[PDB]
């Protein structure tokens, strides 16, 4: 339950979430928890443009997710997660951040490679099977992390 973000960020979250989110309480709770669990992530609001051209200001959480120093070869991916205004009824959506990143620094051996489309959107299995009543933002990033991980050593 320890909070890693400073007061200015908590107050900011309080402020920006209110006007946008159908369920501000859950969005605030899940966003704060995410930031507290993944210290490389930061929040901002940005305009997301929908498929039909409609722009919508949304909370976005961004940063570089990296495998831990656990003896395995390190892998990192810069991502941008968007929280839709109907969260958690609707799932977040996540893309690779294409600044200073070449999507081709990701081994085809990495399980995550399979889920990244030509446009940079990451179709994580958890998002496809989203359960509004049982899932949160942390679980999304945890799955992302588990797919970045070097696949286990075998003896073949």
């Amino acid at each position: 339950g320890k909070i890693s973000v400073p007061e200015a960020v908590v107050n900011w979250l309080f402020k920006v979430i209110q006007p946008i989110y159908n369920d501000g309480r859950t969005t605030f709770h899940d966003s704060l928890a995410l930031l507290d669990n993944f210290h490389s992530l930061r929040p901002r609001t940005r305009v997301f443009t929908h498929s039909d051209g409609t722009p919508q200001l949304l909370l976005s959480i961004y940063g570089t997710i990296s495998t831990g120093e656990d003896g395995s070869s390190p892998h990192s991916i810069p991502v941008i997660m968007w929280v839709p205004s109907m969260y958690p009824v609707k799932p977040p959506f996540i893309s690779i951040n294409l600044e200073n990143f070449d999507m081709n620094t990701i081994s085809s051996s990495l399980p995550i490679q399979e889920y990244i489309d030509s446009n940079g959107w990451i179709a994580l299995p958890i998002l496809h099977a989203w359960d509004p009543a049982a899932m949160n933002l942390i679980m999304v990033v945890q799955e992302l992390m588990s797919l970045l991980h070097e696949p286990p050593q075998d003896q073949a």
Partner: peptide
């Protein structure tokens, strides 16, 4: 509101 960023 317009876009904002407590870090930038």
């Amino acid at each position: 509101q317009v876009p904002s960023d407590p870090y930038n």
